[PDB]
Structure 1
C-alpha cells in the first residue's frame, strides 16, 4: 500500500542485531544487556524478553522451522535455544574467536563467521539441533566477514 503501519520505540539504545523467525513472523532484537526481545507490529511492548548471554549479544539466527534459535555474544559462547515453549539452551560451546554473524540453511546447517574464517556445523537434524562438537567444513576468507546467507534451493 505504501503506508507505515507501526513505529515502535524499543527503549534499548542503539539497534544493530536483528532477525526474523520465518515460521513465527516475529522480529528478534539483540541488545547489550544480553537479552533478546520478541516484537510484533500490534503491541507497543515486546512479546517476550529472553536472557541468553552474560555479555552483549552480537548475532542471532533461527531455523526455517522456527524450532531452534542460535545466538552469540561477547562472552565467546555459542548458544542454541529451543523456541518451542521451553527457551532453554540446548547446547553450549566456547570459541577462540568471536562469531560475528550466524545463518541457517533450509536443511538445518549452521554457519558462524568469526573474523576472516567461516565454520559450518552439521547435525542429523531429524528432530535434533545441530551438533557443536566438531565443525563440518571450514574456509578462510581474504578479509573479515561482514555478511552470510545461504542460497534457498
Structure 2
C-alpha cells in the first residue's frame, strides 16, 4: 500500500494489504522488523527528519519513536504487556473520528 524512506536513506518502511508492516535496511537489504498483524491494513506510512515512524489505518494515526533501529526491542508494539520497558509502545496517537486518512506528510522543518 505505501512505502516510506528516511532522510539518511538507510531505512525503509513498507505496508501491505496483508495487515503487515515491515522495516527494512536498504543499504544491506536486511529485514529488521515485521509487525505481522495490524488491526486493519495501513493505508500510509511516513518517516520524519528526526526518524519518527507514522502509520495510518483508516481513521487512526499512530506514531512510534526509535522504531527504525536494528535492536529487537525497538520493534513497534501497540501495548506493553505488564509495563515491559523493552516493548516500544506508540509515541503518539490520534483518531479522525469519521474520516478515512488520505495521505500523510510531515511538515519539513516544523514539529
TM class by shorter-chain length? 0.7 to 0.9
**Structure 1 residue 124: deviation in Å?**
7.5
2:33 & 2:4 partners in 1: Cα distance?
15
**Alignment RMSD:** 1.6
Match of 2:107 in 1: 151
Provide the secondary structure at the position in 1 that maps to 2:7: coil
**Structure 1 residue 131: deviation in Å?**
3.8
TM-score, normalising length: structure 1: 0.57
**Structure 1 residues 91 and 110, CA gap change in structure 2 (3 angstroms):** same
2:67 & 2:90 partners in 1: Cα distance?
13
CA contact (8 A) 2:53 2:67 kept: no
Aligned residues: 93
CA contact (8 A) 2:11 2:25 kept: yes
Structure 1: unaligned runs, 5 residues or longer: 1-57
2:43 & 2:51 partners in 1: Cα distance?
19
1:118 & 1:131 partners in 2: Cα distance?
18
1:59 & 1:66 partners in 2: Cα distance?
16
- Runs of 4+ aligned residues of structure 1 deviating over 6 Å after TM superposition are none
Higher strand share: 1
Match of 2:31 in 1: 89
TM-score, normalising length: structure 2: 0.77
Match of 1:68 in 2: 11
2:44 counterpart of 1:101: yes
Structure 2: unaligned runs, 5 residues or longer: 78-88
Larger Rg: 1
Match of 1:29 in 2: none
Structure having greater relative contact order (Cα 8 Å, sep ≥ 6): 2
